């Protein structure tokens, strides 16, 4: 796992150095960075094409301490066309993303061939100080990545979407 060290205001990748100073655990920091900063498309039809359903892979949750303000967040309440639930319920201790300028709440029906929804690019779904590989029902999340560093010594708008055929190439919104 790569470790970042900030030297003379320049970030470097850790490699024995004998010149880096680490005297407390407060210097170690985990930061969750959103994918919107990288310039990816934040549109709802574009974002949903990066998520897929699979079975046999247990979900995993990692912890991060510092986050980034998100201009776009997603909330999913998707059911099967017969009324049965598609996404699992959020476990105890997992909450929505705290800072979200816009929350895209998407609801409707569509096929769900897997127990959990993963990210096709391998990214994580950021939650309140927790990053998970799967999407939980009715919880605000942001897509992003987590980095580890050695530190040197609010209004939200909700948008409603109605999607049919979610997870396919024939998905109609509103």
């Amino acid at each position, epitope marked *: 796992i790569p470790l970042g060290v900030i030297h003379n205001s320049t970030l470097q990748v850790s490699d024995l150095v004998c010149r880096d100073k680490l005297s407390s655990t407060n210097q170690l920091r985990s930061v969750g960075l959103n994918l919107e900063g990288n310039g990816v498309a934040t549109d709802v039809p574009s974002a949903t094409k990066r998520w897929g359903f699979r079975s046999g892979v247990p979900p995993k949750v990692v912890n991060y301490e510092a986050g980034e303000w998100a201009e776009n967040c997603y909330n999913l309440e998707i059911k099967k066309p017969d*009324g049965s639930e598609c996404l699992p319920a959020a476990p105890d201790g997992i909450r929505g993303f705290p800072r979200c300028r816009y929350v895209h709440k998407v609801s409707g029906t569509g*096929p769900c061939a897997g127990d959990f929804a993963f990210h096709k690019e391998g990214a994580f779904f950021l939650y309140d100080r927790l990053a998970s590989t799967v999407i939980y029902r009715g919880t605000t999340f942001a897509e992003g990545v987590v980095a580890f560093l050695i530190l040197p010594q609010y209004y939200s708008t909700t948008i409603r979407y*109605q999607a049919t055929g979610f997870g396919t190439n024939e998905t109609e919104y509103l």
Partner: antibody
Amino acid sequence: VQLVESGGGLVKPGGSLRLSCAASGFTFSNAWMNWVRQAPGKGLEWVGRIKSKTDGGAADYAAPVKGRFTISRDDSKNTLYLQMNSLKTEDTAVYFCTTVYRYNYDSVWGQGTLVTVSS
Amino acid sequence: SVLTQPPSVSGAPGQRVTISCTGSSSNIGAGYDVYWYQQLPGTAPKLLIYGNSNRPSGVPDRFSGSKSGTSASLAITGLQAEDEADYYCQSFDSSLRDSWVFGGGTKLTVL
């Protein structure tokens, strides 16, 4: 769990009718409702569907019956209403109301109401 | 009828019979489940198989279902004399805004 259907009769083409299904033994407000019709000596045909109140209570209709049939539900009375307008000869079929009360897939089908449209 | 089924299937008692349901990428290739219904003459349809292969409680184990590609099959291990009824396969279509699609209808006759 039981579904009882009523409201069928002989109606000339161009008339209107209202079909009602009564639900008991389960929570009617938390279950999706579907209408399926079967022509005499033919296969099953899907008519429409209405979702639960928590899901917005939207109604979707099949293409042949789109723009002419209206489906509504009464949560207080645990009853499902289907309003049929501009009836035609091809609409002569036996209508069924279907729902799922437990998501281990225990489904309930009504007895069926015969609607005859002839002149 | 979006789905395609044989017009009629017949077999000797005690043998194994199969009913084939034919769909497409939008119907079955998109991941939608295939539901099998049995309708005795003059009665309401009964859901023999839900999901893809699961069976509701109170249904004999003789009825089994499987999914392969864009087609589905219903298998009856024991062809009893009480199985003479119409069989339908129901799924969902990605097009037409998740509307129900039914098969043509297969009539089973016990020899």
